[PDB]
Design a protein around this ligand. Structure first.
Ligand SMILES: CC(=O)O[C@H]1C(=O)[C@@]2(C)[C@H]([C@H](OC(=O)c3ccccc3)[C@]3(O)C[C@H](OC(=O)[C@H](O)[C@@H](NC(=O)c4ccccc4)c4ccccc4)C(C)=C1C3(C)C)[C@]1(OC(C)=O)CO[C@@H]1C[C@@H]2O
Ligand SMILES: Nc1nc2c(ncn2[C@@H]2O[C@H](COP(=O)(O)OP(=O)(O)OP(=O)(O)O)[C@@H](O)[C@H]2O)c(=O)[nH]1
Ligand SMILES: Nc1ncnc2c1ncn2[C@@H]1O[C@H](COP(=O)(O)OP(=O)(O)NP(=O)(O)O)[C@@H](O)[C@H]1O
Ligand SMILES: Nc1nc2c(ncn2[C@@H]2O[C@H](COP(=O)(O)OP(=O)(O)O)[C@@H](O)[C@H]2O)c(=O)[nH]1
Lengths: 323, 426, 411
């Protein structure tokens, strides 16, 4: 009675800063084939393979809009943006990016919020008003990005007897217009923390709309724009100095998350209790893993051969994606 | 290497007062005077627990905190109540609320900053900071609410050094006042995320060791805290004397945890003999060996044999040979190998001192991590959800701003802590 | 030329204490001119052993480089940041000594796999040396772990992550395990109190016969480079087995029939070679024998002959050209508190075999078991490593044991 975790992958286009320096296309982009050739023998399974010239509406209609229909089930649905440092996770969902000419430069977030105001227009039956939150996961500490300052001793999480997670110390603002939504995304992305200048912390944007089941059994539905971090592993040659200390603490949280998600599909040697409690980005995604709640995996890789094994490590992120 | 000291709670003063009996005797220190130890090797790394700001004197780098003054007022009247710089005292004449949250949200909360000024004056007072010793109790709010309030602010302040948690878990039947167990739950809900080492102790274990193995029939509490002073005098500055293979706090931290859940530790001390009756002509490291691993001589509530052994480190104190150490550790790897879980081959961690204590020829220091502590917190769970169901002591905590939703989160977090202990008891 | 070495690691420091002690006794060195090394540790305690009592005045103390931060016995910490503060200072001290010496002969590296201390600091230390002085002699030297007499909880991980890269930056390497030395002190030195410092006098004895006697008056003095050409038929830096044979105590030597063939033959009994992977089936590919004292060649060309004509101690078939012998003149020297019994002739053997890969398997599969539950990942990824580092270590030793495999029985 449980639907499996849907598995998708994205290839980014190649920038001239890696093209002219000789980074050959180690990947084999095969979007319609449902698979991707790496090297000469690595052939992996993916439901939706995204080419390096794909459209954000096609990304929106392959995974997100089928969960937007499933958001009206009154149940959870979660899609993140995974990749290594420099994979384009900013472009993947479409926040902290303001061009808005062709409108394909911004991605899923104005499409799902603009379409969310489109769905307020039709379904005028259920009493519904959406409030969202926009938080930071930084050095295993939280920060209300919608506020210029809030105590870390105040911003803590909760857990009930039903089995959910409640936030505290979080500025919650309802929606009235996509101008207000992009105003909160603008002020929040300005309040986040070079060009990206760290691309470091997790920026978590949770959309919340309870669906009043029909003065009765309340049916809660949440949808999740959880933007992940860069997944540099090897890099002795990258993050140095004090900025070494910025990279190193979240780097343990990365394989903490990978240690969590790989404890489900492999029961071969006493597959023990799932340690969601180890990291603060994992307890917020305990609801985002398994069960009647929905989760679809989308990751962004690089065509550069220098991150080749790292791309395979991203594929190792994707190989153990079962459920 | 430098470490500051913390005594919170009405219990805690004594919790470590006896320690400040011991270690000053370990270096040859008067109540007022100086380094009168005859051996120069009692001096060479005293900076881990000490400073010299009046110069000729000695000062324990220590911060003594209570929410009711008369306890530490009795301490400063004690025999070692003059060796403190009394400006290091931080307290108040507030009502020391027996609520956890009243020491965690209101009373000490307007005394936190007064503590933090002394931890910052004392932290960068001298050379590079090494670790923190948290001596308190869970038996009430005073060591627990202000305790994890302190160190929960401290890890936000200092994300770097080591947090040693001397907790006092209540004994599973010999209670104190039956309002008790909530002062475990909300405390330990905010222990595991804000420490990396927790040496938990248990009361009826103290009566078990003091009352039976030592044949003294009258367990004075100063003798109990004297035994805990033998523990922490066993652990750290023992390694900060010369040692053949001498570890630190950080090595023990990386050793005895599988995971960052850190799986709170259970200490023991080997030579436990009655006073004059135990002429024995068989006292050496070896004895410490079989003495360490029995069901008694354990400061834990549950029987340690009842689960596996994940990691056990030992700190042997005496002029001795590692062949007749590591051979004995091989014996423990053999004769008890069923409950000595297989998939880590070295559950042992050898630690070698060079010095005895003041009178004994040879001692030893047990630090343990079984899986058996599963049936401690489950015990603490089983009482917790028992008289949570009546909701009958709910008003004292609601009246201090603590809300409803916190409790069930604490139940789930300590709950699946117990569940993963079961998942690795195997 | 009177060669200048390094010592990191606590056992490396104390093994230089007794080793360097036997140095500064056997050449007639008074307890008050020239010391010829450096001592590095990530805690000033172990150095403050030597920096306090005896053998304190006999150094110019402006070179005993210490780090007042954590001892930090975990690999990824000791390779990265916590030794990064000190590595440059060590480099400038050793290049200052490189300039002060004239015609430096090589590097012998005393450290340990047994902790993070002499593992990653040693790893990029040797890496930085091969960047600096790659056209030199590199003789790394760690104490190999015990297979079941082990000490650390992370007992694989330091060694496993070390051999990931310490192979590519030295050629000759000597690894000796503790347990059989406990068998020697227990049995053949015949005492039941085996001390760390007595072990240190034993390795200090064998290194005391590697080079200081071989730079003393020897008629068949051997170059250090003749080790790194003789002992390996392949350029893949492998590692032999070294054993000092005359381990009799003071009560034993009312034993007037004691000659070169005795300890010569005793170099080849299997439970004496100071490693717990005895030549049950290890075909020898290389054997350098270094003798000292009044050595008679009759035991040489009768005893070594009947070793090779035993045909029970079978060499490598396809590559059997495995002898290299040199004899010094000077006898060894009695440590005044020591245990060796003033022997008028002595043999330090060494021999690269087949067997060590099995010992590596003793470390390997053990290493896999604690990897099998993803156990200690959070410390090392908490210091700057990842899953792929462990995987490259595992594949690295996986190819290594097959390189040890095909040279032997495969003829
Ligand atoms: C004549 C003689 O040898 O007396 C011994 C003695 O009889 C025995 C029984 C001691 C004695 O300890 C106790 O009776 C005891 C009392 C309360 C709680 C715990 C223990 C002793 O009091 C304790 C004392 O311990 C020390 O001196 C250590 O350095 C110890 N010191 C303290 O605990 C201490 C006590 C008072 C004031 C300051 C310090 C220590 C241990 C570990 C780390 C640091 C210090 C010793 C050897 C003895 C006496 C004096 C009788 C024993 O304990 C210790 C900790 O050594 C109890 O079993 C051991 C075996 C000893 O042989
Ligand atoms: N043979 C021998 N081995 C030793 C001796 N001392 C330590 N060892 C082994 O070496 C391992 C650790 O290597 P060391 O260099 O001595 O210790 P370390 O890593 O420097 O520890 P720290 O000084 O705290 O950093 C231990 O596990 C011991 O098994 C010794 O004196 N002789
Ligand atoms: N699939 C992609 N599509 C369009 N632009 C991309 C893509 N990938 C990378 N880029 C561009 O190249 C740069 C690198 O992307 P970037 O998002 O900064 O890396 P990142 O690791 O994902 N950082 P972050 O999203 O903040 O965690 C950006 O300016 C992108 O516009
Ligand atoms: N070992 C030891 N434990 C004690 C002693 N006195 C009290 N305790 C335990 O510690 C707890 C007291 O903590 P405390 O701060 O004094 O109580 P609170 O003021 O209400 O928080 C009690 O539950 C006792 O079980 C003592 O002298 N020695």
């Amino acid at each position: 009675e449980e639907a499996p975790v849907r598995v998708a992958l994205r290839v980014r286009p190649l920038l001239p800063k890696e093209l002219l320096h000789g980074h050959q296309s180690c990947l084999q982009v095969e979007p319609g084939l449902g698979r991707v050739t790496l090297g000469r023998d690595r052939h992996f399974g993916f439901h939706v393979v995204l080419a390096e010239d794909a459209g954000q509406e096609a990304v929106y209609q392959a995974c997100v809009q089928p969960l937007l229909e499933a958001f009206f089930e009154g149940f959870n649905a979660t899609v993140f943006a995974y990749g290594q440092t420099g994979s384009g996770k900013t472009y993947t969902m479409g926040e902290a990016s303001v061009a808005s000419l062709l409108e394909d430069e911004q991605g899923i977030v104005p499409r799902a919020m603009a379409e969310a105001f489109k769905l307020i227009d039709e379904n005028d039956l259920l009493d519904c008003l959406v409030h969202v939150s926009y938080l930071e996961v930084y050095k295993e500490e939280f920060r209300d990005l919608l506020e210029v300052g809030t105590a870390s001793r105040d911003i803590q999480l909760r857990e009930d007897e039903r089995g959910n997670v409640v936030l505290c110390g979080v500025k919650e603002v309802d929606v009235e217009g996509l101008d207000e939504v992009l105003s909160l995304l603008e002020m929040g992305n300005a309040a986040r923390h070079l060009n990206h200048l760290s691309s470091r912390s997790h920026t978590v944007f949770t959309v919340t709309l309870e669906q009043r089941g029909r003065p009765g059994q309340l049916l809660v539905s949440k949808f999740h724009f959880v933007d992940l971090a860069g997944s540099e592993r090897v890099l002795k040659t990258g993050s140095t100095g004090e900025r070494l200390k910025e990279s190193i603490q979240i780097n343990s949280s990365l394989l903490a998350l990978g240690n969590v998600i790989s404890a489900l599909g492999d029961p071969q040697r006493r597959g023990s209790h799932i340690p969601y409690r180890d990291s603060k980005i994992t307890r917020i995604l305990k609801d985002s893993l398994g069960g009647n709640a929905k989760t679809v995996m989308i990751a962004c890789v690089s065509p550069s051969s220098s991150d080749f094994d790292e791309t395979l490590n991203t594929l190792n992120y994707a190989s153990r994606a079962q459920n | 290497r430098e470490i500051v000291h913390i005594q919170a709670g009405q219990c805690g003063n004594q919790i470590g007062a006896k320690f400040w009996e011991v270690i000053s005797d370990e270096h040859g220190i008067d109540p007022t005077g100086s380094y009168h130890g005859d051996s120069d090797l009692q001096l060479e790394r005293i900076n881990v627990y000490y400073n010299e700001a009046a110069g000729n004197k000695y000062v324990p780098r220590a911060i003594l905190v209570d929410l009711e003054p008369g306890t530490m007022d009795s301490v400063r009247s004690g025999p070692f109540g003059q060796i403190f710089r009394p400006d290091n005292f931080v307290f108040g004449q507030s009502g020391a609320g027996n609520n956890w949250a009243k020491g965690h949200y209101t009373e000490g909360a307007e005394l936190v900053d007064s503590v933090l000024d002394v931890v910052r004056k004392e932290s960068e007072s001298c050379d590079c900071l090494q670790g923190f010793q948290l001596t308190h109790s869970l038996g009430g709010g005073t060591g627990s609410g202000m305790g994890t309030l302190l160190i929960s602010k401290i890890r936000e302040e200092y994300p770097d050094r080591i947090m040693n948690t001397f907790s006092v878990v209540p004994s599973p039947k010999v209670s104190d006042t039956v309002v008790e167990p909530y002062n475990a739950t909300l405390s330990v809900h905010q222990l595991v995320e804000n420490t990396d080492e927790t040496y938990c102790i248990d009361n009826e274990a103290l009566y078990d060791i003091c009352f039976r193995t030592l044949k003294l029939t009258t367990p004075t509490y100063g003798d109990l805290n004297h035994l805990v002073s033998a523990t922490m005098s066993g652990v750290t500055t023992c390694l900060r004397f010369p040692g053949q293979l001498n570890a630190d706090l950080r090595k023990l931290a990386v050793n005895m945890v599988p995971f960052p859940r850190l799986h709170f530790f259970m200490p023991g001390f080997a030579p436990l003999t009655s006073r004059g009756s135990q002429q024995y002509r068989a006292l050496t490291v070896p004895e410490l060996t079989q003495q360490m691993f029995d069901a008694k001589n354990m400061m834990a509530a549950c029987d340690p044999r009842h689960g596996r052994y994940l990691t056990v480190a030992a700190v042997f104190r005496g002029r001795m040979s590692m062949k007749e150490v590591d051979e004995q550790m091989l014996n423990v790897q053999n004769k008890n190998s069923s409950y000595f879980v297989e998939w880590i081959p070295n559950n042992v961690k050898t630690a070698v001192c060079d010095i005895p204590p003041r009178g004994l020829k040879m001692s030893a220091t047990f630090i343990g991590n079984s899986t058996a502590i599963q049936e401690l917190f489950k015990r603490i769970s089983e009482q917790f959800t028992a008289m949570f169901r009546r909701k009958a002591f709910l008003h004292w905590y609601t009246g201090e701003g603590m809300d409803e939703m916190e409790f069930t989160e604490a139940e789930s977090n300590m709950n699946d802590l117990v569940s993963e202990y079961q998942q690795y008891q195997d | 030329r009177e060669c200048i070495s390094i010592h990191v690691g606590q056992a490396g420091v104390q093994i230089g204490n007794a080793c360097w002690e036997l140095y500064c006794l056997e050449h007639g060195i008074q307890p008050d001119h020239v010391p010829r090394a450096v001592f590095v540790d990530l805690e000033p305690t172990v150095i403050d052993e030597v920096r306090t009592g005896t053998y304190r005045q006999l150094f110019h103390p402006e070179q005993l480089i210490t780090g007042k931060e954590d001892a930090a016995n975990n690999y990824a910490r000791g390779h990265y940041t916590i030794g990064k503060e000190i590595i440059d200072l060590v480099l400038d001290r050793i290049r200052k000594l490189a300039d002060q010496c004239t015609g430096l002969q090589g590097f012998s590296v005393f450290h340990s796999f047994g902790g993070g201390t002499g593992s990653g600091f040693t790893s990029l230390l040797m890496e930085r040396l091969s960047v600096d002085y790659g056209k030199k002699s590199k003789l790394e030297f760690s104490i190999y772990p015990a297979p079941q007499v082990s000490t650390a909880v992370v007992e694989p991980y330091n060694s496993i992550l070390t051999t990931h890269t310490t192979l590519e930056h030295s050629d000759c390497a000597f690894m000796v395990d503790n347990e059989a030395i406990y068998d020697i002190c227990r049995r053949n030195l015949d005492i039941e109190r085996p001390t760390y410092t007595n072990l240190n006098r034993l390795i200090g004895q064998i290194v005391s016969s590697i080079t200081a006697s071989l730079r003393f008056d020897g008629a068949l003095n051997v170059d250090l480079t003749e080790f790194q050409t003789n002992l390996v038929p392949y350029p893949r830096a492998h590692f032999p087995l070294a054993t000092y044979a005359p381990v009799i105590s003071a009560e034993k030597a009312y034993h007037e029939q004691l000659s070169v063939a005795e300890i010569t033959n005793a170099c080849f009994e299997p439970a004496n070679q100071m490693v717990k992977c005895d030549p049950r089936h290890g075909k020898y590919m290389a054997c350098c024998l270094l003798y000292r004292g009044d050595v008679v060649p009759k035991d040489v060309n009768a005893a070594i002959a009947t070793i090779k004509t035993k045909r029970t101690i079978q060499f490598v078939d396809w590559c059997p050209t495995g002898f290299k012998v040199g004899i010094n003149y000077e006898p060894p020297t009695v440590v005044p508190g020591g245990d060796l019994a003033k022997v008028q002739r002595a043999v330090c053997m060494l021999s690269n075999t087949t067997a060590i890969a099995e010992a590596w398997a003793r470390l390997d599969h053990k290493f896999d078991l604690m990897y099998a539950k993803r156990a200690f990942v959070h410390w090392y990824v908490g210091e700057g490593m990842e899953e792929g580092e462990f995987s490259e270590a595992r594949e690295d030793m996986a190819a290594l044991e097959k390189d040890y495999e095909e040279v032997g029985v495969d003829s």
